[PDB]
Design a binder for this molecule. Sequence first.
Ligand code: ADP
Ligand code: ADP
Ligand code: ADP
Ligand code: ADP
Ligand code: RGP
Ligand code: RGP
Ligand code: RGP
Ligand code: RGP
Ligand code: MG
Ligand code: MG
Ligand code: MG
Ligand code: MG
Lengths: 258, 258, 14, 258, 252, 14, 14, 14
Amino acid sequence: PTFTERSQLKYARRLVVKLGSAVITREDNHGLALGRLASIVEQVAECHLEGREVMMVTSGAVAFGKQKLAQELLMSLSMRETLNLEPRAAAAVGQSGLMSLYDAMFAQYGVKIAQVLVTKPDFYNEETRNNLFCTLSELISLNIVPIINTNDAVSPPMFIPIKDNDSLSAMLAAEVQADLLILMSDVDGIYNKPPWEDGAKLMHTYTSDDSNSIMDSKVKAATWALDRGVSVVICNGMQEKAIKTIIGGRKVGTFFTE
Amino acid sequence: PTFTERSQLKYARRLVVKLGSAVITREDNHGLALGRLASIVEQVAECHLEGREVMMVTSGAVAFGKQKLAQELLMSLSMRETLNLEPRAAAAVGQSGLMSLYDAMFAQYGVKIAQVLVTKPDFYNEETRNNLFCTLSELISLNIVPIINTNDAVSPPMFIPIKDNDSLSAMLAAEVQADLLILMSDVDGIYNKPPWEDGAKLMHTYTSDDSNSIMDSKVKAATWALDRGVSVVICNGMQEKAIKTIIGGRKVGTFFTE
Amino acid sequence: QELLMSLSMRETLN
Amino acid sequence: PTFTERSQLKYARRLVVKLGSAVITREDNHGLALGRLASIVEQVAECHLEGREVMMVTSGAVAFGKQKLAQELLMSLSMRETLNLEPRAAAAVGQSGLMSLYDAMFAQYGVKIAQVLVTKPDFYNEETRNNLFCTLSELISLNIVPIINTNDAVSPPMFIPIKDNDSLSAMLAAEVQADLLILMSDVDGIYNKPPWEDGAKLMHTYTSDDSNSIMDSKVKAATWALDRGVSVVICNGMQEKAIKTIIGGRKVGTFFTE
Amino acid sequence: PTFTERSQLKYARRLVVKLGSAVITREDNHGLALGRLASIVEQVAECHLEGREVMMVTSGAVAFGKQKLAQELLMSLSMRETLNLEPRAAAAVGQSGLMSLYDAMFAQYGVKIAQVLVTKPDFYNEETRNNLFCTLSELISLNIVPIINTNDAVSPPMFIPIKDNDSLSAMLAAEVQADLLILMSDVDGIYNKPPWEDGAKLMHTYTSMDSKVKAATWALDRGVSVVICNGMQEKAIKTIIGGRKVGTFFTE
Amino acid sequence: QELLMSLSMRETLN
Amino acid sequence: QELLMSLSMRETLN
Amino acid sequence: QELLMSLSMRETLN
Ligand SMILES: Nc1ncnc2c1ncn2[C@@H]1O[C@H](COP(=O)(O)OP(=O)(O)O)[C@@H](O)[C@H]1O
Ligand SMILES: Nc1ncnc2c1ncn2[C@@H]1O[C@H](COP(=O)(O)OP(=O)(O)O)[C@@H](O)[C@H]1O
Ligand SMILES: Nc1ncnc2c1ncn2[C@@H]1O[C@H](COP(=O)(O)OP(=O)(O)O)[C@@H](O)[C@H]1O
Ligand SMILES: Nc1ncnc2c1ncn2[C@@H]1O[C@H](COP(=O)(O)OP(=O)(O)O)[C@@H](O)[C@H]1O
Ligand SMILES: N[C@H](CCC(=O)OP(=O)(O)O)C(=O)O
Ligand SMILES: N[C@H](CCC(=O)OP(=O)(O)O)C(=O)O
Ligand SMILES: N[C@H](CCC(=O)OP(=O)(O)O)C(=O)O
Ligand SMILES: N[C@H](CCC(=O)OP(=O)(O)O)C(=O)O
Ligand SMILES: [Mg+2]
Ligand SMILES: [Mg+2]
Ligand SMILES: [Mg+2]
Ligand SMILES: [Mg+2]
């Protein structure tokens, strides 16, 4: 990799920021988390109006869609039934709503966005893969923030092997040859033992050799994308000013390096 | 088909409205045509808040994207070069912008929309085709207006055989078993000889037998979708209150019937 | 009543 | 005045377009008329990206607010009351919603808008009047479209004497010394006798002398603003491409001249 | 007042939240602070979808307008001048843009907003004052969040005496007889001596910034109970109403 | 029932 | 040149 | 000058 110590992340030229699905929707499931969402959009816009080339891999279209569909189903019962959810339709509604919200929040900063929707078979056809990466590079070189997500509406991938919106981010940030990969999960980082025990220390540096022997999807994707040149940082999405302090060099999250 | 004379279109229960690409962008190519776009959205919202089940097959993501990319490329030259476009990137930018605009215009009426993006191989896998149609029926039965379009960003179909956003509309409105199919082209209808000649009368009723023997893509898709039960009406998108007078029964456009 | 008690909760609000 | 014959309106440098309240809301009162609204915004944006200095005097905040308040009041009854509107609150809600919609529709063209809210006592204080006109001129000289309206929320003027949103437009377009004043009413123009009679011809040119001796608010405001230099054109807002054919020189509406 | 100890703020039925002008725009002045703005809108929407009656007194239309006008003025010079701001116009542009943003962010939660613009002479005419308060009460009783601000576009009041967007908030929350008044300034609270000294402790309870102190003491003598907090803190309203020790609490 | 029949039409939809 | 160097920075971008 | 004449038209507007 090109970055070994955390003090060098100031010169990260190409980012790939992966927004989890617990960083978008609230715990009570009564709308979006505009706090975290708008704070991440603000940090990405101020890291993209600074020269870097950010490229977000969003998630959480299914959860947002499930909320919208629950509302539209509750608003269609008879007055008699009141007095006493498919993943694909949810994905459709949620993707539309989420892209509209991103569009508004980003246009508040003069930044423009684009919506690229990939699938699982688009990463086996060499022609389609090369076309996709030419498209991504061309969009990035025009100061446009692409927002990649799997086409959950017509062919969800759940039903490196792309099995979620994390292996997709690792494959992406390894082919575009990004410099830094920030996985904004909902946990503070990576512990040695699960948090509900005695000895649940945070690991501020995942040393490749030993720590590999002794969140499994995130660890697998991060180790893969690390063996390919990228340097991966796993942080907590529910923290204030996370990207701006990861790139700043302060000790935040887990930093996957040699 | 179920509708033979034009006076019976008042009872059309399931619509499929196909917006051409010349009904969305202006002739000078300096933005959208908010006039025609908002008028069609208003007619669809007032035909969907009336009991019908509308389902739009939009187009013109590539043109809108080409405009946005021309701007973002002109705003990135050096001050020295000023003093003396890929289809896929254009498709990405345009799809995002168009869905955001539809979202705003429809939410002005309380209506909700969903964005389903299909491709050419999604119509050969029987599993994927059946899943897509279950999704569409489930979205329609919740009073949500799906907005179908081909995934031009990663696999454009240009490069019944689905070759454009017209054969797609015919296949769609024949499988969902829609009642009416309205193709909003940019020409007043269908003439016997091209308009720039002597004898360029409009055909207010395309009688199946003879007229088949004596816009070729639109005619082919319309005849196909007519042999399958649907009844197709080709109208002029640049006309004021087109859908509301087609369904009203007034003589507008060409009506493909037996 | 039995017509006001058999409308969808969307028609009632309109 | 500076324009005597309708063929000279191509060189109109400063416009003042007054949108009536019947050009904004529909006849059934179930939302806005996005057709007419978006078409007028499109014509104003394409007449303002051409060098002119447009300045809209909007109306219809009370009607839009009344719709929103009827909804929010119907959605707050008990389930028991269901089974068997102040002008000021309506004005507040409607003004907010209308400005948001204008903002979206105009930003679709790169144009920026500003919201100036005047009252009746702000036209008697010479200090406040001069400050208001300095503000308007400064906003116009930055290629920003101001949108003037009376502060109906806290002091409606209904309850030259400014008695509505028409005398306001005449006073405005006479003090800013505009070149053309377009009153987009809901009637085709000005007839000699009311339309529901025999002899209801349209007057394509309101000759000052005779026609004065033989809609009374609009006529009074137009004659006033005509005696002050401005030249007033009264057209029908429910017509397609009204501003672009008035400025084009075609015979549309009534043209108040000497 | 009705609330004396901080543990009773859970039952605050009527709020009046005053957003400062340093809680809206960033320090570098290159756009809004969507972080703080969206977090406050989220807290107000989740405190208004819970039964309370929130009513925001926004500010910072002039700063946002100044940014927009600087852009539109820089984008209008000749190519030759490039190679080598009135408060009223700024107020107009900023008010429009801010209301549009609030509208979007609130409609993301199903909440509706209304824009009431008052001035200095509208608080002397008894008829106009009574009409304004009837309007506010009627808007609140329909589950609509009014957003009050001074009409800076045509008559800025800078040029209890209403001299800013703080005395306005105190007068408002004293006439509507609100229960709690939250002034979201940009400082952590109220210190005994200025922060850049030795002894700059925070006062967690002001036993009975000069403008904020004057307006708060006034609105306290009238029944309202005022809490001054730091707008740049995460989840400020939800922890003030929760009862946790945050900011300064003006009580007897 | 008499608790489900005395809620505002807004609480029922939530 | 002296016509391209006397346009407003808005006309150049259009 | 030759530094003001070699910036992208986006940096000049900021
Ligand atoms: N070794 C571990 N270290 C950290 N978290 C763990 C570990 N094992 C399990 N977890 C839990 O697994 C969860 C992983 O969340 P994740 O699937 O990344 O959320 P999302 O996909 O919605 O962003 C965390 O909430 C965490 O509590
Ligand atoms: N026989 C015909 N009848 C009508 N139009 C025709 C015919 N032959 C050619 N045309 C022309 O072909 C064009 C077809 O436009 P079309 O491809 O439908 O536009 P879009 O795909 O952008 O909606 C029309 O503009 C029309 O002028
Ligand atoms: N002499 C006249 N000429 C034209 N219209 C008239 C005349 N007398 C009455 N009217 C009617 O008066 C109405 C005036 O509408 P108006 O008040 O301008 O609507 P708005 O204020 O909502 O834009 C028109 O609808 C028209 O039918
Ligand atoms: N005694 C004091 N206690 C706290 N802050 C003080 C005091 N005296 C001066 N200040 C300073 O005065 C400033 C007041 O800010 P303020 O005018 O409320 O901002 P705004 O009006 O933009 O919200 C604070 O930034 C603070 O640093
Ligand atoms: N189909 C993807 C699912 C992604 C997903 O849920 O996984 P996660 O991002 O939580 O690790 C989506 O659009 O939400
Ligand atoms: N890929 C599709 C192209 C559709 C198209 O251009 O054909 P048309 O709708 O003009 O007949 C799109 O999103 O624009
Ligand atoms: N207070 C103004 C009323 C204007 C009005 O209704 O008169 P009109 O524009 O119909 O002639 C408003 O905001 O609607
Ligand atoms: N005219 C008001 C100014 C209010 C103001 O700046 O004072 P502050 O809210 O910072 O204490 C506005 O719209 O910003
Ligand atoms: Mg995962
Ligand atoms: Mg075609
Ligand atoms: Mg009138
Ligand atoms: Mg102050």
